């Protein structure tokens, strides 16, 4: 329908050592059972930003200058923890590190 | 998809009498020349929760306590400026007080 609702952000000074809560990956079909996981890549995955593929928290981990970079583009995938295969169509979403 | 993309989440330790950024409202109809006005209605619109109708920032204007409210249900809209006919259909939307 035109309204954007795949972004988080993070709103910066609150950035450091400490991991603060980006947002979550979520899918309508996770039952809470816990056999689905959770896939992030893209910009600043597997460094500034990590996720628990059971819970689907993303957090960050370093300080974040917005000066040296406005936003992050992110790709969520949903597979299922066993047959590996996808369940929701991969998709992009963006973290705007805030002024 | 089944991707959830559509809420929000606010860190109890942050809420307070100082408004904290909750998150943005935006259509992809938005031009950025101000034309689209925002408009937020539901549980806790225009107290707990304020919007500037321009940019489509939401904040927080009080101290949350997820043992007294876990989660407020919005709504979300778009018109235009001065004819104010809608320009999307309503989103529900819902902000999480984080423990």
Do not use: C
């Given at each position: 329908?035109?309204?954007?609702?795949?972004?988080?952000?993070?709103?910066?000074?609150?950035?450091?050592?400490?991991?603060?809560?980006?947002?979550?990956?979520h899918?309508?079909?996770?039952?809470?059972?816990?056999?689905?996981?959770?896939?992030?890549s893209?910009?600043?995955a597997g460094?500034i930003?990590?996720?628990?593929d059971?819970?689907?928290?993303?957090?960050?981990?370093?300080?974040?200058?917005?000066?040296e970079?406005?936003?992050?583009?992110?790709?969520?995938?949903?597979?299922?923890?066993?047959?590996?295969?996808?369940?929701?169509?991969?998709?992009?979403?963006?973290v705007?590190?805030?002024?």
């Amino acid at each position: 329908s035109g309204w954007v609702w795949n972004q988080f952000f993070v709103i910066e000074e609150y950035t450091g050592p400490d991991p603060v809560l980006v947002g979550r990956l979520h899918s309508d079909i996770d039952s809470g059972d816990g056999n689905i996981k959770y896939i992030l890549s893209g910009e600043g995955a597997g460094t500034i930003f990590v996720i628990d593929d059971k819970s689907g928290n993303i957090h960050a981990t370093k300080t974040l200058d917005r000066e040296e970079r406005a936003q992050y583009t992110l790709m969520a995938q949903a597979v299922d923890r066993d047959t590996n295969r996808p369940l929701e169509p991969p998709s992009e979403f963006i973290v705007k590190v805030q002024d």
